[PDB]
Write an enzyme that holds these catalytic residues in place. Structure first.
Site, PDB file in Angstrom:
ATOM      1  N   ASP A 172      79.289  64.885  19.525  1.00 59.18           N
ATOM      2  CA  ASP A 172      78.798  63.917  18.338  1.00 59.18           C
ATOM      3  C   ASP A 172      79.550  64.211  17.219  1.00 59.18           C
ATOM      4  O   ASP A 172      80.168  63.242  16.559  1.00 59.18           O
ATOM      5  CB  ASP A 172      77.080  63.902  18.398  1.00 59.18           C
ATOM      6  CG  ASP A 172      76.520  62.532  17.488  1.00 59.18           C
ATOM      7  OD1 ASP A 172      77.614  61.573  17.672  1.00 59.18           O
ATOM      8  OD2 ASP A 172      75.546  62.370  17.167  1.00 59.18           O
ATOM      9  N   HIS A 255      81.352  55.074  18.662  1.00 63.03           N
ATOM     10  CA  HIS A 255      79.985  54.792  18.754  1.00 63.03           C
ATOM     11  C   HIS A 255      79.730  53.367  19.157  1.00 63.03           C
ATOM     12  O   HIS A 255      78.771  53.286  20.001  1.00 63.03           O
ATOM     13  CB  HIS A 255      79.279  55.025  17.341  1.00 63.03           C
ATOM     14  CG  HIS A 255      78.843  56.457  17.200  1.00 63.03           C
ATOM     15  ND1 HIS A 255      79.572  57.606  16.973  1.00 63.03           N
ATOM     16  CD2 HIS A 255      77.624  57.103  17.299  1.00 63.03           C
ATOM     17  CE1 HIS A 255      79.025  58.855  16.922  1.00 63.03           C
ATOM     18  NE2 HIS A 255      77.708  58.412  17.285  1.00 63.03           N
ATOM     19  N   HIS A 258      79.477  53.890  22.949  1.00 63.06           N
ATOM     20  CA  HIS A 258      78.481  54.637  23.204  1.00 63.06           C
ATOM     21  C   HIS A 258      77.439  53.187  23.423  1.00 63.06           C
ATOM     22  O   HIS A 258      76.539  53.473  24.502  1.00 63.06           O
ATOM     23  CB  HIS A 258      78.168  55.507  22.289  1.00 63.06           C
ATOM     24  CG  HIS A 258      76.728  55.997  22.038  1.00 63.06           C
ATOM     25  ND1 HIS A 258      75.672  55.133  21.295  1.00 63.06           N
ATOM     26  CD2 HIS A 258      75.998  56.848  22.642  1.00 63.06           C
ATOM     27  CE1 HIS A 258      74.415  55.324  21.566  1.00 63.06           C
ATOM     28  NE2 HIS A 258      74.510  56.700  22.347  1.00 63.06           N
ATOM     29  N   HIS A 273      73.218  61.599  24.322  1.00 63.89           N
ATOM     30  CA  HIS A 273      73.912  60.867  22.947  1.00 63.89           C
ATOM     31  C   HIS A 273      75.466  61.250  22.984  1.00 63.89           C
ATOM     32  O   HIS A 273      76.391  60.550  22.941  1.00 63.89           O
ATOM     33  CB  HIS A 273      73.191  60.807  21.928  1.00 63.89           C
ATOM     34  CG  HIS A 273      73.959  60.256  20.812  1.00 63.89           C
ATOM     35  ND1 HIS A 273      73.907  58.678  20.529  1.00 63.89           N
ATOM     36  CD2 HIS A 273      74.625  60.742  19.955  1.00 63.89           C
ATOM     37  CE1 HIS A 273      74.534  58.610  19.532  1.00 63.89           C
ATOM     38  NE2 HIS A 273      75.224  59.637  18.932  1.00 63.89           N
TER      39      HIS A 273
HETATM   40  N1  LIG Z   1      69.030  57.899  13.832  1.00 66.22           N
HETATM   41  C1  LIG Z   1      70.418  58.537  13.923  1.00 66.22           C
HETATM   42  O1  LIG Z   1      71.209  58.459  13.143  1.00 66.22           O
HETATM   43  C2  LIG Z   1      70.735  59.045  15.304  1.00 66.22           C
HETATM   44  C3  LIG Z   1      72.189  59.365  15.103  1.00 66.22           C
HETATM   45  C4  LIG Z   1      72.370  60.144  16.432  1.00 66.22           C
HETATM   46  C5  LIG Z   1      71.825  60.411  17.431  1.00 66.22           C
HETATM   47  N2  LIG Z   1      70.392  59.614  17.435  1.00 66.22           N
HETATM   48  C6  LIG Z   1      69.293  59.677  18.348  1.00 66.22           C
HETATM   49  O2  LIG Z   1      68.927  60.923  19.042  1.00 66.22           O
HETATM   50  C7  LIG Z   1      68.681  60.590  20.145  1.00 66.22           C
HETATM   51  C8  LIG Z   1      68.914  61.657  21.277  1.00 66.22           C
HETATM   52  O3  LIG Z   1      68.280  62.858  20.820  1.00 66.22           O
HETATM   53  P1  LIG Z   1      69.093  64.293  21.438  1.00 66.22           P
HETATM   54  O4  LIG Z   1      70.289  64.442  22.047  1.00 66.22           O
HETATM   55  O5  LIG Z   1      68.439  65.498  20.806  1.00 66.22           O
HETATM   56  O6  LIG Z   1      67.787  64.062  22.707  1.00 66.22           O
HETATM   57  P2  LIG Z   1      66.228  64.028  22.672  1.00 66.22           P
HETATM   58  O7  LIG Z   1      65.495  64.145  21.468  1.00 66.22           O
HETATM   59  O8  LIG Z   1      65.686  62.927  23.647  1.00 66.22           O
HETATM   60  O9  LIG Z   1      66.030  65.269  23.762  1.00 66.22           O
HETATM   61  C9  LIG Z   1      65.931  66.701  23.223  1.00 66.22           C
HETATM   62  C10 LIG Z   1      65.665  67.266  24.450  1.00 66.22           C
HETATM   63  O10 LIG Z   1      65.938  68.622  24.177  1.00 66.22           O
HETATM   64  C11 LIG Z   1      64.587  69.454  24.257  1.00 66.22           C
HETATM   65  N3  LIG Z   1      64.736  70.211  23.280  1.00 66.22           N
HETATM   66  C12 LIG Z   1      64.715  70.299  21.908  1.00 66.22           C
HETATM   67  N4  LIG Z   1      64.703  71.285  21.409  1.00 66.22           N
HETATM   68  C13 LIG Z   1      64.839  72.384  22.363  1.00 66.22           C
HETATM   69  C14 LIG Z   1      64.968  73.782  22.298  1.00 66.22           C
HETATM   70  N5  LIG Z   1      64.906  74.357  21.462  1.00 66.22           N
HETATM   71  N6  LIG Z   1      64.884  74.287  23.710  1.00 66.22           N
HETATM   72  C15 LIG Z   1      64.846  73.291  24.549  1.00 66.22           C
HETATM   73  N7  LIG Z   1      64.682  72.347  24.616  1.00 66.22           N
HETATM   74  C16 LIG Z   1      64.805  71.696  23.510  1.00 66.22           C
HETATM   75  C17 LIG Z   1      63.626  68.309  24.133  1.00 66.22           C
HETATM   76  O11 LIG Z   1      62.181  68.814  24.438  1.00 66.22           O
HETATM   77  C18 LIG Z   1      64.123  67.214  24.725  1.00 66.22           C
HETATM   78  O12 LIG Z   1      63.729  67.032  25.942  1.00 66.22           O
HETATM   79  C19 LIG Z   1      68.709  59.278  20.663  1.00 66.22           C
HETATM   80  O13 LIG Z   1      67.577  58.253  20.701  1.00 66.22           O
HETATM   81  C20 LIG Z   1      69.766  58.616  19.561  1.00 66.22           C
HETATM   82  O14 LIG Z   1      69.538  57.371  19.291  1.00 66.22           O
HETATM   83  C21 LIG Z   1      69.781  58.900  16.252  1.00 66.22           C
HETATM   84 ZN   LIG Z   2      76.129  59.941  17.514  1.00 64.02          ZN
END
Ligand SMILES: NC(=O)c1ccc[n+]([C@@H]2O[C@H](COP(=O)([O-])OP(=O)(O)OC[C@H]3O[C@@H](n4cnc5c(N)ncnc54)[C@H](O)[C@@H]3O)[C@@H](O)[C@H]2O)c1
Ligand SMILES: [Zn+2]
Ligand SMILES: NC(=O)c1ccc[n+]([C@@H]2O[C@H](COP(=O)([O-])OP(=O)(O)OC[C@H]3O[C@@H](n4cnc5c(N)ncnc54)[C@H](O)[C@@H]3O)[C@@H](O)[C@H]2O)c1
Ligand SMILES: NC(=O)c1ccc[n+]([C@@H]2O[C@H](COP(=O)([O-])OP(=O)(O)OC[C@H]3O[C@@H](n4cnc5c(N)ncnc54)[C@H](O)[C@@H]3O)[C@@H](O)[C@H]2O)c1
Ligand SMILES: NC(=O)c1ccc[n+]([C@@H]2O[C@H](COP(=O)([O-])OP(=O)(O)OC[C@H]3O[C@@H](n4cnc5c(N)ncnc54)[C@H](O)[C@@H]3O)[C@@H](O)[C@H]2O)c1
Ligand SMILES: [Zn+2]
Ligand SMILES: [Zn+2]
Ligand SMILES: [Zn+2]
Ligand SMILES: [Zn+2]
Ligand SMILES: [Zn+2]
Ligand SMILES: [Zn+2]
Ligand SMILES: [Zn+2]
Lengths: 366, 366, 366, 366
Positions: A172, A255, A258, A273
């Site tokens: 990312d 993006h 994506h 993501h």
């Molecule tokens: N608002 C924004 O600017 C923005 C920017 C980029 C991405 N996003 C969003 O981020 C989301 C994706 O987030 P993501 O990739 O972190 O996935 P996620 O939040 O869905 O999942 C993260 C996974 O990792 C696990 N996890 C977290 N910390 C852990 C740890 N220390 N040990 C083991 N497991 C752990 C969690 O239990 C979960 O299953 C999407 O919905 C995307 O739209 C938002």
């Molecule tokens: Zn991103």
């Protein structure tokens, strides 16, 4: 001419074991909080946080996050928080948990603390949440009048998180400079509202330099579950630099591609993501004028980090032109970020997706 | 190891004529404000701002700022604001007006808008105010839990401000990299509370590059009272880059020397904050290991901008060793920023002040 | 093949006000000393040293040095020291005082402390003394089985010494690399007894780099009588680097020319050792294959430091070929150092002296 | 500000067959010596030395060194020497023999000659001995008022010593620049007592350059048992440059880690001092901010020299976190050298040990 705008979370704190100082960072703020985490994260850090708050006489309503950043979940937690009279919202976890916490805080006009437990996306610092349907289908964006008040990043917690989540975060963050540079050159706008500032350009360019210099060492650090200067640098790049750089630096084709994947149903949606953004970044490079060596510099790094570089890697092996065109049409919809830096049609983008796959295959055959 | 902390104003907006959009940036916030400016600034921009607020049905209590950032003035304005039920504080002017506005906003827990009418110091973005006695003698610092909510920088207003105020701002901003670099190298702390982040380092280093590249063109732009890309770059460097860089990047000897001058009474106190900092920066370079060419690179730029480089220029011509030692003792007091990067005594600092004067004289004799 | 030899004083200590720690550096050594200084130096530092020794219950026989490093003076002081039962000899002053102290210590087999009060030559660290007749005419060399035990260099004392003495020291030290490089290239021997070591080469080359980088700043520091990092660097270059570099790095033509001047009587002998060596260095460069730009790099620095670069500057204006040939014959005597790096005749050397004068004149006419 | 101190052995002589000139270097000193060597070294060089002394009418008490640098052994030899009325102590062998000889000379206030028969550590030139228990367990340090009087290095003897001992010496010497650079940057102190001098910095930096340029050729030279210019350069780097550089340049984390291993019992203690230091150096690099390429530059050289780079190579394969923490706690004890350049905890150091192992494994998998 045009106005330049820069926005930022009020305070970013990063370091080993900083989670144990949470009570100290909230002393002046309040004594009633709501803590949001999913089942896994409650065990990894949620209980530790509650314990530290209790030791400081700060109350904490414990909420188990459903797992999806949806309107219903937000409503549910906000109710729980209102009832508890919570003045502070603490979101603990990955991107979906954090995006949900921001929404809940907005509903309550509460102080918001963001505690990422993986450096997997640049969601932490931004003034927006990505909202999905309860079933996991993208639905909309939720923008706020403010970025988070406090982003607290504990590198010890992140050193113990799955290596795949650090690689996703590096993916990312590698999109940051490629996209901001394209917006700076085209005179387009950023999510902050204006043209980029020199501050955002400096931040975005340093983001890429940091990742090429320390990314592999940081990945090896996580594999061994240890905190090193390389990991500290990459966690900052994945969080603060990538966050400011995309929001105040600009988004472009990577993006948008994506987002275009949501036009398809399938196993591709089990990718993270960041994994999707890695491929989207190669597509943007294929739409730009770069030499083969330039493009291979990125492909080489993605491969070292076990990130996807071909259509087969993103679960679209032998996808049809028609399927790819759905992605391209979605990526070029009115309002998408690709228009901030390119004047291309869906057909141009579909060609670039196949080109990127071909360039990666050509590299792999060596 | 150590934690890194970065803090920032929530939103920074810069551009030509942005003052005319003030009502638009406050729509969601409130409809009752207090506007603070001194007599001169009321004519230059204060009335224009009130007019724009009226056109948007936002009320505005007009306050004439005394001219000094003192406790009494703060108390006075806060009372006026409470009575007026103001929810928003708008500070318009130079550093003293802005520092006063931040204090007033803190007393009221109000939204604070900072509108610099000169790019003369890096006071705009910071979470602190420098408080003086009613008579103009330094008294103390006032730190806040938050940086300003909105910093609105109109380059048209600044293009018409006295060239001396832009040169002063460039001087304050040239200290940024020199001081932050020294803190980064020594492992010291910043005003934000921890060690610098890579973000602050990138910002501080870009600040210096920007000033060497565009500073003279920006100075010529102001002389002709026009807005050019060079001026836009230098106003951002003097405000956003210098502001983040010093606060989250670190202070060291240059600003400690500036503070040491308060140990003396005299005409030196008619110099601006930036003019004093220019000399303080040369002193810091004389305390470091630089070649003659390196030091002359800065002296050359200061001279082009009509900034002081000798003791005679700062109104201490033929000052005595005893007078200089008072400055040095004050600059090396416990708690001063010089200790974040150097292990020096007052005598070492007094020698460095005379050395800097000698190096500048040697350059001038050529 | 050949053996490499490196020799050095046992301990070198340099810093501001280190003279006040003299009693601490001698605690384990003894309690009866003899202090040697000339009339001027007794006032500048001699009494201060005695005071510090008294405060530590160390006795000190006070000796007023005649002013010339002659056999008679050495005998005289040694007698005084024997009578006083002195176990430690402390030489305080310039080169002649230090060379005398080494001889006295050798006669007594005493611990020897060398305290230079000017950084005017590289005599401090070396295992030899240059002995003169009572009338000031060179007589011979006195080599020892050991270099001095302690060289104590107080930069505060040196910052207050005449600028001409620092410039002289820089001149003596600029000869270091030029001469050692020529010995390293020719496979010749050093005063230590063998071919140079890599250590001596590193030291000698760093000596020149240090002087070009900080020499002018150090000279300006002394003019203002202050201690700066530039002065600290140049005092080390003039003392420790120049000392090790010449003794263990090698001497060649520059010092042979300096010695050749003793074949002449006249006002040239009021010049310092370093002033004569500056011209000798230009002569060596004229005997080597350098471009005009290379040679001018040194001439430019000598002029900035007010050092002599022409025959007129060394009081030999319009000297005759016959007078110059006496210098050249003396400089090429059997046993002189020029033979360690060159295969030249007296006539070749006389031509090079006139050439150096011509090159300097050509530079000055610009 | 701070004082800079440089110390050194009085004379260093290096060359092929210099052992045969030993009688010549002692003519003025005395005619009664004690020669200390272990059983193996007596055959390699001890008898040759005695023969040369006899031919010069210098008597020599022959002592067979036990093999460990312990207090009891020192006492024993000193008695033998006192009885023999020895005025000169000649230590012949590796680090333990030399450290023992220095202690014996100190007890007698004798002239000390150090004759290394392998270039395996930088013990030769230093003013300290590392004392062990009779059983081989570290016990303490023994510092002296003087560095050795004469260090005599015969490259013919070293060309015939085991290649593993030259590789160990290169490892000890590669730590020199890495550690001194960290002390110079942090403003810490050296074993000499003050901040480093420019001389020590020049020496330490040249040490590393010499090793990267000639180290492999020197290793191949020893494999073929021949003396070449490459071997002469590396023997000087391993002895004189590494010796001055560490003592007067500074120690930091690499040697602290080496010392931390004494907290463990096991096969790791059969490794040489240099082999342990090689790993300690990688740990220090993992605690610094270096890119992957920088770190791999050292790993590549260690592998070419058959030096250990992983925990498995140092006999700690699959060591537990608890065992590594014992090393880290010992390495971060009060008084250890790591504090001269880093502000780290035992936990930070334990993480860096695992990181270094991971980085090396990642390189090996390529
Ligand atoms: N608002 C924004 O600017 C923005 C920017 C980029 C991405 N996003 C969003 O981020 C989301 C994706 O987030 P993501 O990739 O972190 O996935 P996620 O939040 O869905 O999942 C993260 C996974 O990792 C696990 N996890 C977290 N910390 C852990 C740890 N220390 N040990 C083991 N497991 C752990 C969690 O239990 C979960 O299953 C999407 O919905 C995307 O739209 C938002
Ligand atoms: Zn991103
Ligand atoms: N809190 C901080 O971080 C911080 C940082 C740096 C400096 N400072 C403070 O800043 C203050 C110095 O501020 P300053 O140098 O701007 O001086 P200032 O505020 O005292 O004065 C600025 C002067 O310029 C005039 N001015 C402003 N805009 C103008 C315009 N457009 N045209 C003509 N005149 C105009 C004002 O009327 C005033 O007389 C000090 O009190 C210093 O402590 C604070
Ligand atoms: N043995 C060696 O290796 C060696 C090497 C180089 C030069 N030398 C010898 O050095 C001698 C020249 O020494 P030199 O140039 O220092 O001259 P110097 O010793 O004759 O005179 C130095 C002069 O400076 C004055 N002085 C010293 N410290 C002072 C201070 N702090 N303030 C004011 N005056 C001060 C002294 O009173 C004296 O008049 C020659 O005899 C030369 O042979 C010896
Ligand atoms: N005082 C210091 O500054 C200092 C600095 C570094 C290391 N050290 C000390 O050095 C010691 C380690 O010394 P070391 O690595 O040389 O080991 P060592 O002295 O224990 O052993 C060297 C081994 O090599 C053999 N050897 C020596 N020359 C030989 C030759 N020519 N041919 C064959 N074998 C030969 C010896 O017989 C011996 O078994 C430690 O006790 C360490 O503390 C001291
Ligand atoms: Zn599935
Ligand atoms: Zn300032
Ligand atoms: Zn006045
Ligand atoms: Zn000389
Ligand atoms: Zn005369
Ligand atoms: Zn070692
Ligand atoms: Zn064993």
């Amino acid at each position: 001419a045009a106005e330049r705008v820069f926005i930022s979370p009020a305070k970013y704190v990063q370091g080993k074991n900083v989670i144990t100082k949470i009570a100290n960072y909230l002393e002046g703020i309040g004594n009633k909080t709501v803590v949001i985490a999913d089942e896994i994260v409650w065990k990894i850090a949620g209980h530790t946080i509650v314990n530290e708050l209790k030791k400081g006489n700060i109350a904490a309503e414990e909420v188990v996050f459903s797992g999806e950043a949806s309107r219903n979940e937000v409503e549910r937690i906000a109710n729980i928080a209102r009832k508890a009279e919570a003045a502070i919202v603490i979101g603990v976890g990955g991107g979906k948990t954090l995006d949900t916490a921001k929404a809940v805080a907005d509903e309550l006009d509460a102080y918001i603390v963001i505690v990422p437990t993986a450096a997997s996306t640049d969601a932490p610092t931004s003034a927006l949440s990505v909202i999905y349907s309860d079933d996991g289908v993208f639905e909309s964006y939720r923008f706020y009048k403010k970025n988070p008040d406090l982003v607290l990043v504990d590198t010890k917690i992140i050193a113990n998180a799955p290596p795949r989540l650090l690689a996703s975060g590096i993916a990312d963050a590698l999109a940051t400079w490629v996209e901001a540079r394209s917006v700076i050159k085209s005179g387009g706008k950023t999510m902050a509202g204006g043209i980029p500032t020199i501050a955002a350009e400096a931040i975005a360019e340093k983001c890429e330099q940091t990742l090429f210099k320390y990314g592999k060492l940081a990945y090896e650090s996580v594999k061994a579950k240890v905190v090193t200067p390389a990991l500290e640098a990459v966690v900052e790049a994945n969080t603060l630099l990538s966050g400011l750089g995309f929001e105040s630096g600009g988004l472009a084709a990577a993006h948008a591609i994506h987002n275009g994947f949501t036009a398809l149903e399938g196993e591709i949606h089990h990718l993270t993501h960041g994994e999707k953004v890695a491929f989207g970044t190669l597509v943007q490079l294929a739409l730009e004028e770069h030499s083969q060596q330039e493009i291979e510099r990125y492909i080489e790094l993605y491969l070292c980090l076990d990130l996807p570089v071909t259509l087969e890697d993103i679960k679209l092996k032998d996808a049809s032109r028609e399927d790819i065109l759905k992605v391209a049409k979605a990526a070029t919809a009115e309002g998408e970020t690709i228009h901030n830096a390119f004047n291309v049609t869906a057909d141009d983008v579909a060609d670039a997706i196949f080109a990127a796959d071909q360039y990666a295959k050509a590299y792999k055959e060596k």
